[PDB]
Amino acid sequence: EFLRFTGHRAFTQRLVLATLYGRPIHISKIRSSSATNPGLAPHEISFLRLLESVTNGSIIDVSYSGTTITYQPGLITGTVPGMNASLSSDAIEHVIPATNTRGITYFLIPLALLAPFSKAHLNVRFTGPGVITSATHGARDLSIDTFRTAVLPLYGLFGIPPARIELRVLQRSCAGPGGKGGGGIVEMRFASQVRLPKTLHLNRRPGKVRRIRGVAYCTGVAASHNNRMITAARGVLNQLVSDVHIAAQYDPAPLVAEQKKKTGIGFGLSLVAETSAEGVIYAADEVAPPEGGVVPEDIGEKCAYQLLDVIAQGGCVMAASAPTVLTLMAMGSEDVGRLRLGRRVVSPELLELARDLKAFGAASWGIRDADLIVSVKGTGVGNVGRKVA
């Protein structure tokens, strides 16, 4: 109620920072221009559902309009058998409704950044009709493998061990009928909490990019297609790099309630490039258009070109993971976090994150050259609840 926000941009970001701060906020004018479908979006309201589920003690209200909301954050606790669930290793269920277009990663990255600041573990289980696992065309949402091997090594850099970072898919899925649809189930066991993560100094140049790995997924189509994608992408990249290596994976189909029906048909491919210096990684993805049927070779060329563009453009961290690592460096201890960013890599989204953090009241960012070295001053809050034994 006390702090206020406007518009619909960076909704998840504003929300998760309000959780991380315990600052009671109130946002207005989500979809004021849209007289067609004003107010919330369904992925947002399921997002609010999930937030209320995972947290405890939080209060959220949405207008009769649905276009203005107000939120009193409680605590990040996690899979607790007293309140939330039945057991310790009990997994908290989450359905998201069928009319979802947006990404699983669009659910994950806020959840991913918040959850190391819980009292106990996290055991989310995403099922539902609208569980896409692939990348969207959409807001160009990430895919599962991209998300995993692209941002979780960064938590490994931040001090949170991938040894107890756990994400597994059981079913994968594409969009299907339009952007809506889904069907692939996933479950994540964040088993590593820390008091305060390591404040980090990525300042050395990530010069020699050593290799490229990646993953072609096909959900309902023959594996010849993703094979062809490997051929296409290696035809792009072998003029640069010998060690390019792409696993392939085929899933038959997801089946969804209406009686059941097959959905989530499609395919796409993820590219990650790995720098010899330290955990510096450049990723991109491309997904087939959910009703299109374009040539997988063209998709391979496209994803290849996207990877090459982030190679050219990115200083060390790519723009997709930029908000994450910045927020974690912000929630690092009361010290300087020193990241080496590139000039093209700055986004209006990153600037919005800067603005909203400044609205929250934690300290600021100093910007000097080297590409631009940014430095943040950590507010050193960390998790609030933890059974320190």
Partner: peptide, 24 residues
């Protein structure tokens, strides 16, 4: 096609565990 990587690269990549940064 030469995309077939390795059992080890498979185990580090497509498994539930994300690959750590601090290894070679």
């Amino acid at each position: 096609a030469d995309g077939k990587m390795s059992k080890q690269e498979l185990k580090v990549y497509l498994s539930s565990r994300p690959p750590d940064p601090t290894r070679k």
